[PDB]
Structures are given as C-alpha cells and as structure tokens.
Amino acid sequence: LHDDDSCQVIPVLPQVMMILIPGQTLPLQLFHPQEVSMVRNLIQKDRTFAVLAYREAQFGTTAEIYAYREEQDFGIEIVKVKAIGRQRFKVLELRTQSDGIQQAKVQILPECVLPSTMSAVQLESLNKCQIFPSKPSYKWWQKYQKRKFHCANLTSWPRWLYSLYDAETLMDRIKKQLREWDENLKDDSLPSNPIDFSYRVAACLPIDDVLRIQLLKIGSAIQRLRCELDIMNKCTSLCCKQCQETEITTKNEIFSLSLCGPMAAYVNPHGYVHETLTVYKACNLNLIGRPSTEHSWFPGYAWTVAQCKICASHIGWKFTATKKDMSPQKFWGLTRSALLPTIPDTKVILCL
Amino acid sequence: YKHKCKYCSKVFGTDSSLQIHLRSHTGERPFVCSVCGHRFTTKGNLKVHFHRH
Amino acid sequence: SYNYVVTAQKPTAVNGCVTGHFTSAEDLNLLIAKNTRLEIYVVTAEGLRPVKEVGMYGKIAVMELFRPKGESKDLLFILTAKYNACILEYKQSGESIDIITRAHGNVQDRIGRPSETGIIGIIDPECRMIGLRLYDGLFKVIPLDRDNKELKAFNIRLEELHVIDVKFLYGCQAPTICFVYQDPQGRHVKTYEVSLREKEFNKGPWKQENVEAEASMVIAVPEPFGGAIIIGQESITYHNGDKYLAIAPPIIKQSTIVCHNRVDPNGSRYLLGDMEGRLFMLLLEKEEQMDGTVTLKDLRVELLGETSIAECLTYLDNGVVFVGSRLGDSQLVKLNVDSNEQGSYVVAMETFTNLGPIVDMCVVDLERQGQGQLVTCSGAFKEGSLRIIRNLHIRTVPLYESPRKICYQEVSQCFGVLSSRIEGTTALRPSASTQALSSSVSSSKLFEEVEVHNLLIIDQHTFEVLHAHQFLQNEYALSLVSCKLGKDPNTYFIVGTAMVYPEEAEPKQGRIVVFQYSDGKLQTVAEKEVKGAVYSMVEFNGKLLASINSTVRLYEWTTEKELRTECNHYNNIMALYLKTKGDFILVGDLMRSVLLLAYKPMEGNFEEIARDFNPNWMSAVEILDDDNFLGAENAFNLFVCQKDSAATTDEERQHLQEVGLFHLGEFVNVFCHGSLVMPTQGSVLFGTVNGMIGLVTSLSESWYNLLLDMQNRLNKVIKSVGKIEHSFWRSFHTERKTEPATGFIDGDLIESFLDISRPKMQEVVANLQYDDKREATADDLIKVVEELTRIH
Ligand SMILES: O=C1CC[C@H](N2Cc3c(OCc4ccc(CN5CCOCC5)cc4)cccc3C2=O)C(=O)N1
Ligand SMILES: [Zn+2]
Ligand SMILES: [Zn+2]
Ligand SMILES: [Zn+2]
C-alpha cells in the first residue's frame, strides 16, 4: 500500500490492454519468459504491477497478484495469474527497458473521503439523534431523509436535494436496479463502504472503455455513485460499438445465469478474457456456424458465434440448451468490448 | 515463442510436437480465431478478422 | 484576486450556555457561547449585567466551568472545532479585564473517525481529568494536574464504537463515565471506571442492556442520589446499580427532548427543552426515610410552557432561566409558582435578537437616500422572521413560519417572500400565510408532517402580508425573481418550483409561474411547464435565465405575455447555483463544480469558457468581477478562482486557477452585492447560519501586500484567548486537508490596529514599506484602516 500523492516506479505488462477498476479481478496467462520471470519476482516483493489506462495512457491502476499457477504442458511453461486492482494513479513517465516490459514513474491518487453534507450545519443539540436504529421499507427511508437532513432548514436547499448527494441513499437506489439483473446477491454481497461500493458497480455495469475511464477520473465516491446511477437510468439500450447505431439489446433483457452477477469474466481456450453479459433477447445478430459445446462457459449450453448484422463485427455468442430440463433454453452472451451504452432518443447528458 | 500452430495459434516447444497436433484441424475451415471461435477458409481471412478485435 | 473580509455583524446565535463563579467566588456568572465569541455576564437580581466579551480563533465546541481542589474561583475549559484545547481563568485588575490562559494544547489525533454524535467534552466531578469523545472507539483523557500546562493526554480504546452520549457520574469511588451506545443488538447503557495511573478502563459498577430504542441523552444525578437519568423519545428512566425506575409520559411524545439543565445543586429538579419550543420540568420525587437515607420514589414531568426553540437551557436564579436559541431569538424567561390564564408558567423577560439562520437576503434602498438596507429571511419554523438591518439598527418582522427566499419589487413598493408552513391538513399555529389580507390558491392542472409553500406579498412600509398565494399540492417553491421581461413594461414576480413526490428521487416536472401584484391580489400571468426542478432563476438582459436540473436555459418574453425557449446548454453537473454578470454565466452544483458560460449574442447560444471540478460541499457562490469568482465550501471556508491570465493554450483558458483560500469560520448561505454605507473596489455582503453578516471587498496588489505584512505583525502583539494562532485559525480546513490561507485579508485583525496601545502600534510599523518607497510611520496606517473601516 503506497502513500497518498507519493511516487513509485512500477513495472507494466506490455500485453495488458484493459481498464482495471480498484478491487476488480484481472486474469492473466503469460507464455513469454520475460513476462513469466517478472511475475515470479513480484511475488517475492510487492506483487504490484501497473495496468495502464488507454497507445497513449494518462491514468491507471495498480494490480496486486493474489493467485499463481504453473503448467508445463507441451514443452511450454504456462503461467496463469489472477490480480486485483488496488490504487489509482496518474502517469508521470513511461520508459521501456531492456526486454518487452517497461517501467512507469507514477503518482498515486488519493481516494477522496468527504464527510456528510450536514457535517457542518448540524446543531449540537440534535447531534445525539444522528444515530438511527438500523433498517429492519419505503417509509423507513422517508424517515431517514427527514431525520438525517432535518438541519436543511438552516441552509438554502431542501432535504430531497441532499438525498441526491447522500452516499447511503444513492447506494440503495443502485441496489434496487442491480437486483433486477440478479435474483441472488441479497442486501449483502455488495460492500457497505461507498468507495468500495462505487468501484464494484463500476466494474459490474456493461459499459464501454471510455466510460470506465470517466469513472476512474471521478474524484469523490459520491460523484462516482451519481454518475453510475445516471448510466443505469439513461443508457437503457446497448448498441454495437463499431457502427455505433445498431441496437443489439436493451436494459430490460439483462439477467444472471451464473450466480456471480449478470456479467462475470470468463476465459477462452487461448487465454482471452471475456466480460460476458447474459441477456434473454438480442437483435441484429448473425449466427456463424453451428452450436458447439467445446469449452462452454455454461455447462449444458452450446455456444454459437454471433456477429453484428450491419458491421459484421463480433458481438458475442448465442447459447442454446443441450437439455430439455433447463431454463432458459436459449440466451445470449455478449462480450463487453463489443457493446456501447446508448441513451435512446426522445439532448440527454450523463450527470455527475 | 516459435513453433506456433497456424490454425489455432497454440505454441509448442518442439516442431515435432507441432506436427502431431496439426491433424486435429481436419476440415474445410481449419483456421480458428483464438478470440471468439470464428472459423475461416484461408489463413489470410483469419488474419483480417483477428485484427478487427 | 486579492480580497478583504471584515465582519459587519458578529454571530448572534447561541450554541452554549453555562453558569458558575468565573469572575469571583461570590459572583454568579452566565457564560454564553456565540460561535466564535464568548460573553460573560454577572447575574443580578434585576437582570443581567455585561462584564467582558472576548473572541476566539476557533469555533467553540465544548464550553464548561470547573474548579479543581485548591483553586480560588472557577476555571473555564474551552475546546474548538479544530481541537484547540485551553483552560482559562478570569482576572480583573481594577478595569483591565483579561482572560488569561492557564493551559492549552491541540488534542487532535492524526487518526480516528469523527464521531456521528459529535464532539463530547466532559469533566470529572472532583476535577481530576477531562474526558473527550472526538473519534470513534477512542476516549482522550486529560489529567487535571497543574503540571499539564501543554495539556498532554492519552487515549483508551473503546470496544463500543457508536457512543450516543457520555457523562461523568457523581458520588463514585473512582472516576466513572456512563454512556449509551448502539450495536446490532440494540441500544444499551454501560459504565467504565478510569484509572489515571493504569491508563486503561476498568469494570464499571453496573450496566443495563436493551434501553430505549432511541435513547439519546445521559443526565448524571448528583451525589444525593447518584446514577444517571437516560432520556430518549418514549421514556425517561433512572438507573443506579440495581435501582431502576422508568416513566413514559404521553406529554413528551410530540417532540424529542434535546437539551437539559439542573435547577437545584442536588439534582431534584431538571429542565427539558424539545425540538418545538416546549419547556418541561423533570422532578425527582424523593422520599425521606427514617435512617437518614433519602430514596428516589418516582419521576414526574410537567409541561411548563413554550419558549424559543431552545438549543441550550440554563437556570439562573429567582426562577429566571436563559433560553439559548439557534433558530430564533434567545431570551430570559421567568417561571411562576402558579400557571397563568393559558396554563403556562413561563413568561418572557428579555429578548435578544438573533439574526440566524440567514437563508436569504437582499439590499434595498428603502428611504431613497442611497444608504442601503439589508432585509433577510431569518429563523426557522415558528421562529421565522424578516430582519431589517441598518447603520446597527435591527427591526424584526415575525412571521411564525419559515421564510425561504426574498426579493424587493420597488414599483409595487413591496417585498416578495417565499415561505413554507408545516401542517385534510390543519395549521399548527396562525402564520404569515394564514393571516394575509388576501389569500389565493393556484390552479394549473398541468400536473405525519407536510410542507405548504406560499408566496407572501409583504408591504415595504408596514410589513403586513397583503397577499398569500398557496402553491400546488406537492409543489416545492425553489426560486423567486422580480424583474421586467422583454418589451413588457410591467414588473413581475417570477417563481420557479419543483414537483416533489416521496416516491421519485429526482424531480421530473416543475413550473415557472409569472405573477403580478397590481391591486390587492396576485394574478397568474401565464405559466410554463418544465421537465425538472427550477433550482435558480436570474434576469438576463430583459430575458429570464433558469436552471432545470442539469440544464441552463434562456427564456424570452414574447408579446403574447408567454415564455419561449431561446437556447439551451446541457451540463454534466446539476445546475444548482446560477449567477450572471453581463453575458457571463456562472453555474455550480453542491459539489464545488464551477462552470463559466458565456451567452454569445451574435449566435443566440451559450459557450463554455472555463471549468474547475474540486469535489467538496459548496454552499454559496457569487461573481466578484468578470474573471474572479467567490464561493463558500466545507468546512466553513471561502475560496476564489479566476480565469487563467496565461492566455497561451486553449486548454489553459478553460481551467480556473484557485487564487484565494480562507477559513471564515461561518457557514455562508447567500451572497449579495451591496453595502450599508453611502481605496477598495466591490462590496459583497454574505449572511451565515449563526447570524453573522460579513463583507468581501477586493484590494489592489499594492495594498494587499501591505495588509498581509501588518497581519503577521499585528499577530505578534495581540493576545489570543487560548493561545491559538491566526495562521491556524484562518487556514483552509477540512478533515482531509490542512492548507494555509491565501488571497484573503482578515479585516477584523487589521481593524484591531486602532485599538492597541501606541507603544505597540510602533512595534508593528517598524521596518514597514508603503508604496505611496519610504518607511511607514505609525500615522500612515491609521489612515489606511480608517478608510477600511468605512466599507461597513
Ligand atoms: O462460452 C463460450 C463462448 C465461446 C468461447 N470460445 C470457444 C472457442 C474455440 O472453441 C473451439 C475449441 C475449443 C477448445 C479447444 C481445445 N484446444 C485448446 C488449445 O489447444 C488445442 C486444444 C479447441 C477448439 C476456439 C477458439 C476460441 C474460442 C472462444 O473464444 C468459449 O470459450 N466459451
Ligand atoms: Zn455493428
Ligand atoms: Zn492448432
Ligand atoms: Zn474473432
């Protein structure tokens, strides 16, 4: 754990093209000796390398290695490694060294911890009533807003405005729609810390890369929550990233076949990771070939390559059932790097 | 590394090990995209689709 | 920018009141805390006599008197919000009155989370320690031995991390603290013994689990009985070891008891004030036994009457009580043995005007003499009032409801005031809306406690509510503007509202209503439906600028007397604050995101000139000039940012550079260009929560460098109560940051030059340079501060 605003020279994997959220898992599979030996030396040190944010990178996140496996198959030493994002940063200098790896002089960004809005206006006679009995309803929230924000009569703004900037209220509003995408998770699963909660939803939403960078560069966690909730309410249609305007699927089609949410990271037979979003119905997709069960990420289902009808780029795979006693008998698995969250027309702009 | 299969892009340690696997790609469309599983007729066709990822 | 801030009116709200023998052992004193000020009165049989008023370089957070063994009179412990601890002694030598500092230190720990229930400061009854609850899971102990002049302290880990209230218990063998805490199981009461030698916690005498769900207050009972009284919302219980009593009087259920005070030094009588102004008496009915013991038989609560919404209560003598109020005026009240004709034992004696909380204001030239008068919306709920401040002469116009916004329409010789009243729903009391001379209700069809919003038409001479217009059901009035629009020669009242429904978080519908007061009623001259909350409106050269959620929109007044959208500008931040100067438009949200927009008159659209996003809670903002912009942010700070003078890259021109930082010590709610008077340029008044009115004027670079020098020099000859340094007090402060001040000059410290001794006046002008570059005679600087005392 580095100090805030401090500087570190952290190595970079030259074949890691990805926006890494703090707390998000990064799966790696290295063949080359310079990449392999670099992983081993981090294990006997800090396990911390840099995942840069794009080939000109301006920000990024440090990754800590928490898993390591070795396979010596077919005369080639396979090294698979799982990492987890940790600290955000801004790049100061990138310097390529002897082998393919490179060093990065880096300044650590601090996680902006802001107090409550009423931390400055609350009267001390009512300080004793700031702790409320925990939540056992939608009338409990009408009391939480009244009680927590009573001192708004001392400012120029009502209570219902401070709720839109209240961290605890925004997480619950995001929790509501997140549960519509997954019949499990429950009130737990997601962290209670707003900073940790914002970084989980940042890695959970099916958003493109330039939208993931904006969530990284958003300073406060309260702003990161409002922008995240803004994406879920406005960007209801997912279009093909290539041709921009071909609508593949909408927000109401998302569901969770795997218990790990409606969007888990899966690995293909050659090391490529695919943040696959499972939806019920899809549009403007051409099926390539016949179904196949080989290396299927969902046992009992057969995958078929699905491509965009207009631009002929890869969008995902259609999964059909190989058994009758399975529901759904059909669903679509759309990879993230192929979609583009779109605000359907009636100028709507994402708000912080 | 070298000794890479031209159809699926798997790397082997020895050119010997390459050949014993080379006849698992029996078919008209033996070239497979290591990213999505797309099969193609020629190596050049696989390259164009690969570099669109 | 180089700016100059001077206090035009000291804070008026009362956040603390303690009594004791501070001046002399015989004298009974009343010490009152007004944010950054401390008033000391001697309580006479007639009333109250002022003795000495001092100011501090901090926001007084805890103010308590105590007398350790072997001390002549009582000593004063004061802790600031910035964690400056100090023990103070009163000392008078004829007429020279000075508050000496017997000990001082900074108790701030680098770690620790600031507690939810606030800073708590308690003292052992026998004065052997000072207990502080600043951070969760910690308890700072300051040994009260006269070798601790730097106030060295130690911490003790607290396995209970959510403490509600804590107090020191009376009549205990060892120093015992008794507190109420909450955990997943519920709310409980637990006691700890403190060992100033083991520096840890020992097992307390007793504990009671499963106390009231919303138990909020701990009252320590003196040694005649000992123990503690725990007061929540539903119950008043007494505990001591294995002695238990509890009552649930239905008379204290309509509100919550939030303050207390002991009436007799034996703990037999207690005063309780609630959130709505009620005053109760908690009597501990004792039963005299035959073996010399006195047991506690029952608890009894009787309603005494109504006062101002009391933040702090303290009993003086001869049935006189001081009601310290933050929302409304503080008062001296007299209690009677028998109730009056309405069943109230409380009768008012004196009332001290409290300007806080100022939620809106406006400068008006009432008497046309070019003097300038400030008329503010002040108070909350039944304490709401208008205050007409002059050159200071304050007139009070009570409204008995909460006033929100104000604007002056000279043509009607009238004030337009937005207000809200708390209530088939019936009013709780006759208010300004219910007592208007004429009353209208709005019709549109375009779209427990409840808020009813009204536009009140208040006469500029008599200040009587000529008309009260009740807005729609579930309609929340947000903005108010008086202006002429386009070619219309009539001046109108414009109101921007929002449709708030407890089910929808963000507002999706709102209204912009055009009103006119011609005869004795308000006519609705057309309306316009918008798909959001109208947060702010400003007149923009015969046109109406408005905010709709994140949208800034310029409206035009047609010949059909209707509003037509001209151009929009969609922002990625919530357009909450809206201020204009010429064709420049300043936009800001609650999170200190500052956006400068320019209306291009030749293109009929908006252009984004500059931007600056620094996530922090902003409360108010204002345009100083076409380049510099002033605002208020957490915590009680001011800031200025400007368009970059280095006009090299298009990138750099779109970044606003921060040039001013300053810990004002107040929570600014409204900025207002104007002055109270007939060298420096600009005059911006601001009202605050504590009732303080301040000035913001800009200095030349020549003067700024001079007054900054005189600042560091006047800070070497001025004694500060508690030995707090101006540099520390005025430095930009939030829990994450500590940075010195820049671009701001404390006029209060500069004005203290005219009140220091001439031998010390020369001490600061020695080796000074004045660019009139000769040295600065002591007489050149009274001329500069005499002119700086004329802005206010
Ligand atoms: O749900 C899904 C959707 C589709 C996705 N798949 C399947 C797939 C392939 O699928 C044919 C195949 C699968 C497995 C093999 C086994 N080998 C391993 C390497 O050495 C030779 C032997 C060979 C060919 C081939 C290439 C890429 C992919 C790819 O991304 C996936 O993994 N799971
Ligand atoms: Zn496409
Ligand atoms: Zn192969
Ligand atoms: Zn492919």
Numbering used by the authors:
A (entry chain A): 72 to 125, 131 to 212, 220 to 429, 437 to 442
B (entry chain C): 380 to 432
C (entry chain B): 2 to 392, 710 to 741, 748 to 771, 784 to 1014, 1023 to 1116, 1121 to 1140
Authors' text:
SALL4 degradation is linked to developmental abnormalities and avoiding off-target degradation is desireable.
Structural analysis provides a rationale for understanding the reduced affinity of SALL4 for cereblon in the presence of CC-220, which engages both ZF1 and ZF2. Notable differences in these two structures include the location of ZF1 K389 and cereblon residue E377, which shift in the presence of CC-220. With respect to K389, the distal morpholine ring of CC-220 engages the side chain of K389, which is not engaged by pomalidomide because it lacks the phenyl ring and morpholine ring that are present in CC-220. The X-ray density for CC-220 and the adjacent side chain of K389 are well-resolved, and the distance of the morpholine oxygen atom to Cδ of K389 is 3.4 Å. In the CRBN:CC-220:ZF1-2(379–432) complex, CRBN E377 is displaced relative to its position in the corresponding POM structure by 1.5 Å at Cβ as a result of a clash with the phenyl ring of CC-220. Since the E377 carboxylate interacts with the amino group of POM and does not interact with ZF2 directly, the difference in selectivity is likely due to subtle changes in the backbone atoms attached to E377 in the presence of CC-220, which impact nearby CRBN:ZF2 contacts. With respect to selectivity, the weaker potencies observed for the interactions of SALL4 ZFs in the CRBN:CC-220 complex are consistent with previous reports of weaker degradation induced by this molecule.
